[PDB]
Write a protein that binds this ligand. Sequence first.
Ligand SMILES: Nc1ncnc2c1ncn2[C@@H]1O[C@H](COP(=O)(O)OP(=O)(O)O)[C@@H](O)[C@H]1O
Ligand SMILES: Nc1ncnc2c1ncn2[C@@H]1O[C@H](CO)[C@@H](O)[C@H]1O
Ligand code: NA
Length: 338
Amino acid sequence: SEGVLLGMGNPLLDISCVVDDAFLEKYGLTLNNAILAEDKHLPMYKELAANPDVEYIAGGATQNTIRIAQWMLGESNATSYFGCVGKDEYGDRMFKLASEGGVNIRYDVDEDLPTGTCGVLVVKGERSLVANLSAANKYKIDHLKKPENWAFVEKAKYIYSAGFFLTVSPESMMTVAKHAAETGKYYMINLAAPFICQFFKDPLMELFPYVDFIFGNESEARAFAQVQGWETEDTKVIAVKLAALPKAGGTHKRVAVITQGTDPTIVAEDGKVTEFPVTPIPKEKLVDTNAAGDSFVGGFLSQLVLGKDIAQCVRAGNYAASVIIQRSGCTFPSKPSF
Ligand SMILES: Nc1ncnc2c1ncn2[C@@H]1O[C@H](COP(=O)(O)OP(=O)(O)O)[C@@H](O)[C@H]1O
Ligand SMILES: Nc1ncnc2c1ncn2[C@@H]1O[C@H](CO)[C@@H](O)[C@H]1O
Ligand code: NA
């Protein structure tokens, strides 16, 4: 099933460090939040580089999801990934790691900007993200439309992008979403962060009629609900309302999947809510929750591309996230035991 799943996003190198409450207060950051880097965050990246516990791990939300799906599938080149990197060592490092894991990496390159990075600040297992997109922000629709890269869109039956890609190339997302609508394929996104639901609500709502599977966490679902004027904080209601939003075509229903950390995963399908409890990981065994949501999607998608039911997809998602939260960032052993 070569290239059955394609992802498109921002390939970033995670600069991860266990810090404390004072470091977040210093740079005005919030736990369980993601922002785009500002000039005031350049001293932060310098401080992270000098910290003795700093770790450099391949990141990027879509890339994490695709690498996890590939690990769960276990058949080389079942997945593909598009994204933009710089002509530097960080770009080649992520290329080599993901390719060796079995992902068919098709990176676009920027001539002048360095490869994108993300500050991952860990406090008692929880994380705060500060993305410096750099070359990831320069993804070109020209790369997507080149025959050798368009062939992997044609080969794919499932296409996924984290909502973070709406800040970079909403035109590339629309192009592949419209292709999927014309061919009976599945187009899927995540809400990614509250800032995406608030500041990128308009490109998000232009694409939403073409979304067959919408993924998100409870804070994103609540941020989306507040933005749309839905006077509710109930994630069960928000999940049903997300599935019920208009669709460009009736070929597929829209399934909404809302994760809630240690609380049950919510699925809205055909107007009914099903909840799937999480088996919590001991606080002792917990390293960090960075890439937990991305790995839940990766696990869910690995079963979805094999034709499994939605309950088996959620079970595989909870499994993949449980494995990843017992490691730093999006890191995993070489072979699964699902
Ligand atoms: N402490 C935990 N123990 C066990 N599983 C967890 C824990 N935290 C997260 N998970 C798993 O990771 C998934 C995603 O967590 P969540 O915090 O909702 O994601 P995100 O990274 O998008 O914030 C959960 O649905 C669950 O399966
Ligand atoms: N703006 C962004 N675009 C893409 N990936 C991002 C962004 N912000 C954070 N991430 C990624 O989110 C992951 C955790 O979900 C991290 O590995 C980090 O690299
Ligand atoms: Na992404």
